[PDB]
């Protein structure tokens, strides 16, 4: 996966992020709180919104299709997601990814890029 500068983590320290994660997980327990950010140097559209609350049983594949619409991509342009710095399987649910890969602040972080392989 790409080496990420997470703007959410640059702006907000762990204590602040954990408080927000705590709150949102109690308010919306069946939704996964996800922070989505673009890989540095990718020339894809930057998402206008980075914070999403996603149904737990939505698949990665279905999430690809929703994000694709929001970043104005064609069928010709490539889009790849990275969770825990690896590409998730398309049938995996957002709930399963959260269970396995949420950070200590209680968010799931997902990076996107037009490239699939990074040094």
């Amino acid at each position: 996966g790409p080496h990420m500068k997470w703007a959410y983590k640059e702006e907000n320290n762990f204590e602040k992020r954990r408080a927000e994660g705590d709150k949102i997980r109690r308010k919306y327990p069946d939704r996964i709180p996800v922070i989505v950010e673009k890989a540095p140097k990718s020339k894809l559209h930057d998402l206008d919104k980075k914070k999403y609350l996603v149904p737990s049983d939505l698949t990665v594949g279905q999430f690809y299709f929703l994000i694709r619409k929001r970043i104005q991509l064609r069928p010709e342009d490539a889009l790849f997601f990275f969770v825990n710095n690896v590409i998730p399987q398309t049938m995996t649910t957002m709930g399963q990814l959260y269970q396995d890969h949420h950070e200590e602040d209680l968010f799931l972080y997902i990076a996107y890029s037009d490239e699939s392989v990074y040094g």
Partner: peptide
């Protein structure tokens, strides 16, 4: 604020 999908 969070966006609901």
């Amino acid at each position: 604020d969070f966006t609901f999908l």
